[PDB]
């Protein structure tokens, strides 16, 4: 089994830039789609960022343009460039990852991070 560690939250201005990083550990070979998702105070969970080992990406339409996920194998882990922050990407950023013998679902969490956009 893999865990998740997710870091590089906290508090920036409104039209601000943050990066958050999301370091996975043990069986790696067992990693193949990861993402991240956010949740914020209220509101369901949803999916924000996703990318397959190979560099495919995706991004829900509110976030697209302004955030960017991207890999580093060397390091296990995955980021999320948060440029031109609104107040409200308030939330938080939980790190995902899909395990290949069970694919289409989320295998492991991390234990989210919070992200607090100010006015």
């Known amino acids: 089994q893999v865990q998740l560690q997710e870091s590089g939250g906290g508090l920036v201005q409104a039209g601000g830039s943050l990066r958050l990083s999301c370091q996975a550990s043990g069986n790696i070979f067992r990693i193949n789609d990861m993402g991240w998702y956010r949740q914020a105070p209220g509101t369901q969970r949803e999916l924000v960022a996703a990318?397959?080992?190979?560099?495919?990406?995706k991004y829900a339409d509110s976030v697209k343009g302004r955030f960017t996920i991207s890999k580093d194998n060397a390091k296990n882990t995955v980021y999320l460039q948060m440029n031109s922050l609104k107040p409200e990407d308030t939330a938080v950023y939980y790190c995902?990852?899909?395990?290949?013998?069970?694919?289409?679902?989320?295998?492991?969490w991390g234990q989210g991070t919070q992200v607090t956009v100010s006015s």
């Open positions: 995902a990852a899909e395990d290949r013998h069970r694919i289409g679902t989320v295998g492991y």
């Open positions: 990318i397959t080992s190979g560099g495919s990406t």
